[PDB]
Amino acid sequence: QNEIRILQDKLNSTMKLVSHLTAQLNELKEQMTEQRKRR
Amino acid sequence: QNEIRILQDKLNSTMKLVSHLTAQLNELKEQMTEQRKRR
Incomplete structure (x- = not known):
């Protein structure tokens, strides 16, 4: 479950x-x- | 491979x-x- 949460955080970072x-x-x-x- | 992925994530953060x-x-x-x- 912690790994799944980390993967979700990685997806949010993406x-x-x-x-x-x-x-x-x-x-x-x-x-x-x-x-x-400027022109 | 996980360390390489972490390094890639760090590069993305940079x-x-x-x-x-x-x-x-x-x-x-x-x-x-x-x-x-304002002036």
């Missing part, structure tokens, strides 16, 4: 990593918007 | 920390924008 990747994409979009504003 | 640092930089930029708007 979901957090996916959210971090989405945040990185949003940051890239924000950087592009800033570059457009 | 990448998440780098993303957090980028988010902190974005927050600083947002704070600067808010300060400029």
Whole structure:
């Protein structure tokens, strides 16, 4: 049961990593918007 | 193999920390924008 809980925590960490990747994409979009504003 | 998986998870955590640092930089930029708007 403890191993199953650890696996669930690992899955949650993977979901957090996916959210971090989405945040990185949003940051890239924000950087592009800033570059457009500068021009 | 379990140790290798743990190391991979640690690397993912380090990448998440780098993303957090980028988010902190974005927050600083947002704070600067808010300060400029106030002025």
